[PDB]
Design a binder for this molecule. Structure first.
Ligand SMILES: O=[P-]([O-])[O-]
Ligand SMILES: O=[P-]([O-])[O-]
Ligand SMILES: [Ca+2]
Ligand SMILES: [Fe+3]
Ligand SMILES: [Fe+3]
Ligand SMILES: [Fe+3]
Ligand SMILES: [Fe+3]
Ligand SMILES: [Fe+3]
Ligand SMILES: [Fe+3]
Ligand SMILES: [Fe+3]
Ligand code: NI
Length: 225
């Protein structure tokens, strides 16, 4: 009668497992950079196609649940929220794939410099990813606010890294390619962090049936015309 609940809970756990999968992908992409591990980068590139599949499966299951049970209210919100989260997860995987591509290219020549700010960007981003997936599993609107502040740390680091790498590019032509490849990695981390904030926003909607958005440190009701 309400084995609707069994199927919705399984759908949600599928989405969360694909989440835990990209959480590991992002970890592995940044590890391929710091350890200069060609194989690990190649695994991330391969794993991107696994996540394309996961998106297809999530979408299939959402249709099965919607089409058989025709849910309303909370279960309907959860399923549509799952549809949206699975695209965010797939896109995060695209960005991890692109970081890994950059790692392979970086490995063609010697290390440019010590890595501090990029590892720190990644660390903050992986905290945000973990937190987003935990909000999707069990939403706390009062605490979900914290993701926005976390993102501001990633934005500030990105700006620093961008300025520093521009200086390296200008110092010598031999620094240019590595500095660009590193800058592009930083940019991909910054976007992944944005996606983590979007997972929190969608998770809040999933309970509220009303749109919230990060506005720099503040999670507000979508304040627009
Ligand atoms: O598989 P494509 O959306 O990156
Ligand atoms: O913090 P967002 O505007 O990239
Ligand atoms: Ca290149
Ligand atoms: Fe079952
Ligand atoms: Fe997609
Ligand atoms: Fe995509
Ligand atoms: Fe993809
Ligand atoms: Fe931000
Ligand atoms: Fe951004
Ligand atoms: Fe950002
Ligand atoms: Ni693909």
């Amino acid at each position: 009668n309400r084995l609707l609940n069994e199927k919705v809970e399984e759908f949600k756990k599928g989405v969360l497992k694909a989440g835990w999968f990209i959480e590991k992908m992002f970890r592995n992409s940044i590890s391929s950079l710091v350890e200069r591990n060609e194989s690990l980068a190649r695994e991330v590139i391969a794993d991107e196609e696994v996540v394309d599949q996961m998106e297809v499966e999530i979408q299939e299951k959402a249709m099965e649940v919607l089409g058989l049970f025709s849910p309303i209210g909370k279960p309907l919100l959860t399923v549509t929220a799952g549809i949206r989260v699975a695209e965010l997860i797939e896109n995060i995987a695209d960005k991890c794939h692109d970081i890994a591509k950059n790692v392979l290219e970086l490995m063609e020549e010697p290390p440019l410099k010590p890595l501090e700010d990029i590892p720190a960007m990644a660390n903050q981003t992986s905290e945000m990813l973990k937190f987003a997936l935990r909000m999707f599993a069990d939403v706390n609107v009062e605490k979900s606010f914290e993701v926005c502040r976390m993102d501001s740390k990633v934005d500030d680091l990105y700006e620093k890294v961008r300025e520093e790498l521009l200086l390296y590019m200008m110092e010598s032509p031999k620094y240019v390619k590595r500095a660009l490849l590193l800058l592009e990695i930083a940019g991909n981390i910054e976007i992944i962090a944005d996606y983590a904030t979007n997972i929190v926003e969608v998770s809040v909607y999933m309970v509220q049936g009303e749109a919230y958005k990060c506005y720099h440190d503040e999670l507000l009701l979508f304040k627009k015309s």
